[PDB]
Subunit: 78 residues, 14 copies
C-alpha cells in the first residue's frame, strides 16, 4: 500500500504534465493570431488583447486544474 | 484492494489531464480566429466576443467534467 | 474482485477523459469559423450563433455521454 | 471470472469514449464550415442547417453506438 | 475460458469504438464541404444533398459493421 | 487453447475495426471534394457521382475485407 | 503450440486490417482530386476516370495483399 | 521453438501490413494530383499517365517487398 | 517502498518533460506570427511585443508548473 | 536460444515493413508534384522525369535497405 | 533500491529528451517566419531579431528545465 | 546471453528501419518541390538537380547510418 | 544493480535520440524559410543568414543537451 | 549482466535510428524550399546553396550524434 499508493500518487501525479500539451499548443496560436492582427491595424490593439488575455486566461486555467490535482494527489493525498 | 483500488484511483485520477488536450487545442483556435476577425472590423468587436466567450465557455466545460471526476475519484472515491 | 473490479472501474472511469479530445478540437473550430464569419458581415450575426450553439450543443453532448458513463461506473457501479 | 469479466466489462466499457474522438472532430467542422457559409449568404441560411443537422445527426449517431454498447456491456452485461 | 473468452469478448467488443474514428472525421468533412457549396449556389441545393446523404450513408455503414460485430461478439458470442 | 484460441479470435476479431479508420477518412473526402465541385457546375452533376460512387465503392470494399475476416475468425474460426 | 500458433495466427491475422489504413486514406484523395477536376472540365471526364480507376485499382491491390495473407494465415495456416 | 518460432513467424508475418500504410497514402496522391492536372489540359493526358503509372509502379513495389517477406516467412519459413 | 516510492518519484518526475511539448510548439508560433507582422508594419513593433511577451509569459508558465512539481516530487518528495 | 533467437529474427525481421512508411509517403509526393508540373508545361516533360526517376530511385533505395536486412536476418541469420 | 532507484533515475533521466521535441519544432518556426519577414523588408531587420532572440530565448528555456532536472536526477539524485 | 544478446541484436537490428521513416518523407518532398520548379522554368533545370542530388545525397546518408549499424550489430556484433 | 543500473543507463542513454526529433523538424524549416526569402531578394542575403545561423545555433543546442546527458549517463555514469 | 548489459546496449543502440526521423523530415524541406527558390531566380543560385549546405550540414550533425553514441555504446561499451 505505501509501496503502491505512494509510488502510485507519484507516477499518476506527474502524468498531469499533459495539462501542458493541449493548451501549450492552443493559447500560443491565439497569441500568434492576435500579434499579426495587431500588426495590420495597430489602432485596434487592445481591442485585440482584451480577448487574447480573456482567452489566454482559461487556456492556462485547465492546465492548473491538473497542477491543482497534481499537488492535491502529492501533498493532499488521501 | 487498498493496495490496488488506492493506487488505481490515483493513476486513473491523473489520466484525466486528457481533459486539457482536446479543448486546449480548440478554444485557442476560436480565440485566435476571433482576435483576427476583430482586427479587420473593430466596430464588430463584442458581436465577436459574445460568442467566443459563449464557446470558450463550454470548451472549458468538458475539461472540468474530468477535473470533477478527477477529484470525485480522488477525494470522493467509493 | 473488490481488488480488481474496484481499481478497474477507477482506471476505466477516467479513461473517459477522451470525451474531451474529439469535441475539444471540434466545437472550438465551429466557434472559430463562426467568429470570423461574423467579423465579415455583423448583421448576419445570430443567424450564425443559432447554429454555432445548435452545433456547440451536441459537440458537448458526446463528451457528457462519457461523463455520464464516467460517473455511472464510479458511483453507479454494478 | 467475476474478478475478470467484471473488471473487464468496466475497462472495456469506458474504452468506448473513443466514440467521442472521431465525430467530436468531424461534426464540429461541418458546423464550422456551415456557420461561415451562412455568414456569406444569410438568405441561404436553413438551406444550410437542413443538412448540417442532417449530417450533425449521424455524426452523433456513431458515438451513441458506443454509448449503447457502453451501457449494454455495463448494465446489460452477459 | 469463461474467465478469458468472456472478458475477451468484452475487451475486444468495445475495441470496436474505432468504427467511430475514421468515419467520424470523414462524413463530417463531406457535410462541411457540402454546406459551404450550398451557401454559394443555393439553387444547386439538393443536387448537393443527394450525394451527401448518398456518401453520408456508407460512412455510417462501415461504423455499424463494427456495431454489428460489436454486439455479435457480445450477445451472439460463440 | 479454448482459453487462448477463443479469447484470441475475439481480441484479434475486433482489431478489425481498423478497417473503419483508413477509408472512414478517405471516401469522406471524395464525397466532400465532389459535393463542392457539383456546387460549382451543377450540370456536370452525375458526371461527378459516377466516379464518387465508383470510388466510394471500393473505399467501403477494403473495410469489409476485414468485416469478412472479422466474422470469418468469429463464426468461421478454425 | 495449438495454444499459441493458433491464437497467434488469429491475433496476427486481424493485424492485417492495417491494409485498410494506408490505401483507405489514399485512393479516397485520388477520387476526391478527380471528382473536382471533372467538375471543372466535364468533357475531360473519362480521360480522368481512366487513371482514377487505373490508380484506384492498385490502391485496393496492396490491401488485398493482406486480405490474402489474412486468410492464408487463417484457413491456409501452416 | 515450434511454440515460439511458429507463433512468431505468424505475428511477425502480418506485421507486414505496414507495407500498405506508406504507399497507400502516397501513390493515392500521385493519382489524385495527376487526375486534376489532366482535368486542366486533357491533350496532355498520357504524358501524365506515363509517369503516374511509372510512379504508381514502385509505390506498389515496396509494399510487395513485404508481401514477399510476408509469405517468405510464412510458407518459406526457415 | 524506498525501492518503489523512490524509483517512482524519479520516473514520474521526468515524465514532466511533457511540459516542454505543448508550449514548445505554441509560444514558438506566437513568436513566429509576431515577427512576420512586425516585418510588415515596423512602426507597429512593440504594440506587437507587448502581447507576445504577455503571451510568451504564460506559455512558459504552464511548463514551469511541471518543473515545480518536477522538483517538488524530487527534492520535496513526501 | 532457437526458441528466442529464432522467433526474434522473425519478429525483428518484419519490423522492417517500416521501410515502407517513410518513402511510401515521400516519392508519392515527388510523383504527384511532377505530374502536375508536367500538366502545366508538357514540353518540359522528361526534364521533369529525369529527376523524378532520379529521386524515385533512392526513395525506393532506403526501403530495400530493410528488405535486404529483412531477408539477411531471415535467410542469412547469424 | 540501488537496483531500482539507480536504474530508475537513469531511465527517467533520459526521458527528459522530450524537452527537445516541443521547442525543437517551435523556435525553428519563429526563426523561419522571421528570416522570410526580413527577406521582404531588410531595413526592418533587428526590429525582427530583437523578438526572435527574445522568443528563441525561452523556447530554449523550457528545454533546459529538463536538462536541469535531467542532471539533477543524475548527479544530484536524492 | 546467446539467448538474449542474440535475439536482442536481432530485434534491435531491425528497429533500424526507422532510418526509412524520416528521410523517406523528406527527400521525396525535395524531389517533389524540384520537379515542379523545373516544370515552370526548364532552362533552370540542372541548376535545380545539382542541389536535389546534393540534398538527396544526405537524406539517404542518415538512413544508411542505420543500415551500417543495422548490419554492424548483425554481422559485426560484439 | 550492475545488471539493472548498467542496462538502465544504456536504454535510458539512447532514449536521448529524441533530441533529434524536435529540432530536426525545426531548424530545417528555418533553413527552408530563409533559402526561399533569399531567392526573392538576394541583396538581403546575410541579413537572413545572420539570424538563420543565430537560430540554427540553438536548435542544435537543445539536441546536444541530450548528447551531453547521453554521454554523461554513459561514460560519466554515477 | 552480460545477459542484460549486452542485450541492453544492443536494443538501446539501434533506438538511435530516431536520429533519422527528425532531420530526415527537416533538411529535406530546406532542400525542397531551396530548389524551388532557385527555380524562380537562377542567378541567385549558390547564394541559396551556401546556406542550404550550411543548414544541411547540421541537420546531419544531430543524426550522427546518435550514430556516434550508437557505435560508442556498441563498440566502445563500458
Amino acid at each position: 500500500n505505501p509501496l503502491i499508493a505512494a509510488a502510485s500518487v507519484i507516477a499518476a501525479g506527474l502524468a498531469v504534465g499533459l495539462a501542458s500539451i493541449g493548451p501549450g499548443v492552443g493559447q500560443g496560436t491565439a497569441a500568434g493570431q492576435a500579434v499579426e492582427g495587431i500588426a495590420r491595424q495597430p489602432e485596434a490593439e487592445g481591442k485585440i488583447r482584451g480577448t487574447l488575455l480573456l482567452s489566454l486566461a482559461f487556456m492556462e486555467a485547465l492546465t492548473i486544474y491538473g497542477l491543482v490535482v497534481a499537488l492535491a494527489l502529492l501533498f493532499a493525498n488521501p
